[PDB]
Design an enzyme around this catalytic site. Structure first.
Site, mmCIF file in Angstrom:
data_model
loop_
_atom_site.group_PDB
_atom_site.id
_atom_site.type_symbol
_atom_site.label_atom_id
_atom_site.label_comp_id
_atom_site.label_asym_id
_atom_site.label_seq_id
_atom_site.Cartn_x
_atom_site.Cartn_y
_atom_site.Cartn_z
ATOM 1 N N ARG B 200 0.815 -1.207 0.000
ATOM 2 C CA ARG B 200 0.000 0.000 0.000
ATOM 3 C C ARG B 200 0.854 1.264 0.000
ATOM 4 N NH1 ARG B 200 -4.464 -1.413 4.539
ATOM 5 N NH2 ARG B 200 -2.539 -2.175 5.529
ATOM 6 N N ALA B 201 1.904 1.277 0.814
ATOM 7 C CA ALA B 201 2.783 2.442 0.914
ATOM 8 C C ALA B 201 3.557 2.708 -0.379
ATOM 9 C CB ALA B 201 3.745 2.284 2.087
ATOM 10 N N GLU B 202 4.036 1.641 -1.013
ATOM 11 C CA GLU B 202 4.786 1.761 -2.261
ATOM 12 C C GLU B 202 3.917 2.310 -3.393
ATOM 13 O OE1 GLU B 202 5.894 -2.238 -2.039
ATOM 14 O OE2 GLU B 202 8.006 -1.885 -1.553
ATOM 15 N N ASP B 267 7.928 -10.527 0.263
ATOM 16 C CA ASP B 267 8.948 -11.351 -0.375
ATOM 17 C C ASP B 267 8.368 -12.714 -0.733
ATOM 18 O OD1 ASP B 267 10.617 -9.235 0.072
ATOM 19 O OD2 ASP B 267 12.157 -10.379 1.141
HETATM 20 O O1 LIG Z 1 13.540 -1.295 5.181
HETATM 21 P P1 LIG Z 1 14.262 -1.721 3.915
HETATM 22 O O2 LIG Z 1 15.711 -1.269 3.981
HETATM 23 O O3 LIG Z 1 13.605 -1.066 2.724
HETATM 24 O O4 LIG Z 1 14.162 -3.285 3.766
HETATM 25 C C1 LIG Z 1 14.727 -4.129 4.710
HETATM 26 C C2 LIG Z 1 13.699 -4.606 5.707
HETATM 27 O O5 LIG Z 1 12.721 -3.640 5.773
HETATM 28 C C3 LIG Z 1 13.115 -5.963 5.406
HETATM 29 O O6 LIG Z 1 12.360 -6.029 4.230
HETATM 30 C C4 LIG Z 1 11.589 -7.168 4.169
HETATM 31 O O7 LIG Z 1 10.771 -7.100 3.071
HETATM 32 C C5 LIG Z 1 12.496 -8.375 4.086
HETATM 33 O O8 LIG Z 1 13.107 -8.437 2.849
HETATM 34 C C6 LIG Z 1 13.559 -8.361 5.159
HETATM 35 O O9 LIG Z 1 14.508 -9.318 4.905
HETATM 36 C C7 LIG Z 1 14.208 -6.988 5.278
HETATM 37 O O10 LIG Z 1 15.096 -6.964 6.345
HETATM 38 CL CL LIG Z 2 -0.186 1.094 4.966
HETATM 39 MG MG LIG Z 3 7.675 -5.583 0.107
#
Ligand SMILES: O=P(O)(O)OC[C@@H](O)[C@H]1O[C@@H](O)[C@@H](O)[C@@H](O)[C@@H]1O
Ligand SMILES: [Cl-]
Ligand SMILES: [Mg+2]
Ligand SMILES: Nc1ncnc2c1ncn2[C@@H]1O[C@H](COP(=O)(O)OP(=O)(O)NP(=O)(O)O)[C@@H](O)[C@H]1O
Ligand SMILES: Nc1ncnc2c1ncn2[C@@H]1O[C@H](COP(=O)(O)OP(=O)(O)NP(=O)(O)O)[C@@H](O)[C@H]1O
Ligand SMILES: O=P(O)(O)OC[C@@H](O)[C@H]1O[C@@H](OP(=O)(O)O)[C@@H](O)[C@@H](O)[C@@H]1O
Ligand SMILES: [Cl-]
Ligand SMILES: [K+]
Ligand SMILES: [K+]
Ligand SMILES: [Mg+2]
Lengths: 310, 313
Positions: B200-202, B267
């Site tokens: 939703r945020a993306e 994921d």
């Molecule tokens: O916050 P940013 O840097 O965008 O993503 C890293 C985390 O938020 C997590 O993301 C999730 O989807 C997973 O992929 C997890 O492994 C990961 O640590």
């Molecule tokens: Cl949200």
């Molecule tokens: Mg995601």
């Protein structure tokens, strides 16, 4: 106080024994909360490292102009090698025992916007086998110094502090103790003990007045056969208690930035001064001046000869 | 009534998913808090235990393998301890590693500090890979493309996908499907993508806040046309997910009866869709299975995976 010759300080040999640790700092940005928890996310941009614990005490003695030997136990890891590395360029003479199963004590401070967010600690008990080897090396190192400095942070490094105190006093060496815990019977026979309010309040309780504090300390010294007690009181300065009476020195700090490690500066200064023949009373005055100076520096810093005098 | 065909295990075995994107290391520190800091009004954590798991594009690739499919991983990893751990972890993941090394790059690592089953802070180390290393991995992509069925672009804006546009073309021109886990606000780089899977945020970042469900459909339909993207798959947390295509909409509600840890649910989602598509499973059924997988993986702790034996029994 009388200005102290640098060459006189040069013959001050302090043996620092206690809990060594690595002060590591993480500086980063907080632009958002965690998407997993109502906590911040820190994007680290920079890392700084300084010697801490017993190593901080030892280095403070060297910067003042004295000689310092450091007896401690370090693990076989990354923070371990970093301490070895930092000690090699500090001037302190390392006497490190190595424990393979021990995680080297490291205090990790995480900062953002010049504001601390969390401190992460790694530490454990050194093996009994290692502690015996260190005790054996102590007997060897004892006659090579003048003053023995016990830097206790309750990490298990000074498990045999009582035995070591007796051996040093039986050798005519002066024993200084930076206390930690509520036992303090292990500190029996110490020449000088240097607690802060929290550490002293732990063994004698909260005093209701100066006369009450006067009584509890005097009663403690007699009970534990400790010649003098030096109570550092933060912004209240410090007070020395002995049979010769009380000396109170007010805080001399012009600017207070970072306080952390000031107690190390206090006990290192006293020890290195006493090792230079400086009277206990004069050592305390210089210690309070050194503390007031080191308090205006960022991190667990030191104080050089040139700053304390001129 | 049968909602989705139970997929044969050897059918998934022929599914070759090529995961390209930002790979990280999810490290966990479980400690005790017994005191305040003597230096600041903040807690002191005495860490007692450490755990590590594959994260980011790596987590997606491992989800592909546990499900029963095959996964290739083209990514950028630094020359350090966290990097070597990823290499070491990929060794027993079942994922085929295609790692480009960058000595100047700190390997992306998400460090979560916990105490009393409660997270206190997340510490992040990450930087941009160099142009030279990115070009080297870009050329290596050509070698991997004919070796895989579908291409999963796992973008986390850590720099690993600077040349997404170029790769999408090469994959589309080779007749391969391109799935994209988006990041940022541009999304013009994602032009020509088969399926895009924003949360939703993306999505809220590229089309703004939708005021109604009809408003949402309008903006999505507009986006898809404007960006030449066949389908958009919007994951909506506890709302489940909604697939948008020319053939209409499909809304699947959240299925998890136990929600323990959600981290990395998207994921698992795009991973499932990818392997199903590569196994010949139609898109609609893939999304249904993805929603089932997400509901399962949510009931597990940390960045977990869901294996065939759970999704289908
Ligand atoms: O916050 P940013 O840097 O965008 O993503 C890293 C985390 O938020 C997590 O993301 C999730 O989807 C997973 O992929 C997890 O492994 C990961 O640590
Ligand atoms: Cl949200
Ligand atoms: Mg995601
Ligand atoms: N605002 C201050 N806070 C703490 N210490 C100060 C301050 N100003 C001066 N000092 C000096 O720094 C010393 C630190 O001692 P103290 O903080 O009581 O023990 P510690 O907790 O081991 N460090 C004091 O004895 C003072 O001489
Ligand atoms: N209580 C829940 N909270 C969040 N996600 C849930 C929950 N229950 C089920 N899910 C599933 O998790 C999937 C992905 O979650 P979502 O947070 O939207 O994507 P992400 O942010 O990329 N991770 C959803 O589509 C759901 O199917
Ligand atoms: O006792 P703990 O908190 O576990 O460890 C000591 C730390 O709080 C810090 O306390 C200081 O000592 P002093 O603040 O002067 O006692 C310094 O020695 C720092 O190097 C050290 O990291
Ligand atoms: Cl206090
Ligand atoms: K300081
Ligand atoms: K999970
Ligand atoms: Mg102290």
């Amino acid at each position: 106080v009388v200005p102290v010759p640098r060459e006189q300080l040069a013959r001050s040999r302090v043996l620092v024994v206690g809990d060594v640790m690595l002060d590591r700092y993480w500086f980063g940005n907080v632009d958002r909360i965690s998407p997993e928890a109502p906590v911040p996310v820190v994007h680290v941009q920079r890392q700084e490292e300084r010697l801490g614990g017993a190593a901080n005490v030892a280095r403070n003695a060297v910067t003042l102009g004295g000689q310092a030997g450091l007896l401690c136990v370090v693990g076989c890891d990354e923070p371990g090698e970093r301490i070895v590395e930092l000690l090699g360029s500090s001037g302190v003479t390392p006497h490190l025992e190595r424990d393979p199963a021990l995680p080297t004590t490291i205090k990790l401070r995480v900062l953002a916007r010049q504001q601390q967010l969390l401190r992460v600690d790694f530490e454990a008990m050194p093996t009994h086998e290692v502690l015996l080897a260190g005790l054996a090396r102590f007997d060897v190192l004892l006659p090579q110094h003048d003053v023995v400095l016990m830097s206790d942070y309750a990490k298990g490094g000074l498990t045999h502090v009582t035995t070591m105190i007796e051996k040093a006093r039986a050798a005519g060496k002066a024993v200084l103790v930076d206390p930690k815990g509520d036992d303090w019977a292990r500190y029996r026979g110490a020449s000088l003990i240097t607690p802060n309010r929290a550490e002293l309040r732990e063994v004698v309780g909260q005093w209701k007045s100066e006369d009450d504090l006067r009584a509890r300390v005097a009663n403690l010294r007699a009970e534990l056969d400790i010649d003098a007690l030096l109570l550092t009181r933060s912004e209240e300065g410090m007070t020395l208690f002995s049979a010769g009476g009380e000396l109170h020195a007010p805080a001399l700090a012009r600017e207070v930035f970072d306080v952390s490690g000031a107690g190390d500066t206090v006990i290192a200064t006293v020890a290195t001064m006493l090792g230079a023949g400086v009277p206990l009373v004069d050592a305390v005055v210089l210690a309070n001046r050194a503390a007031g100076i080191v308090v205006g520096k960022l991190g667990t810093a030191t104080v050089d000869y040139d700053e304390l005098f001129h």
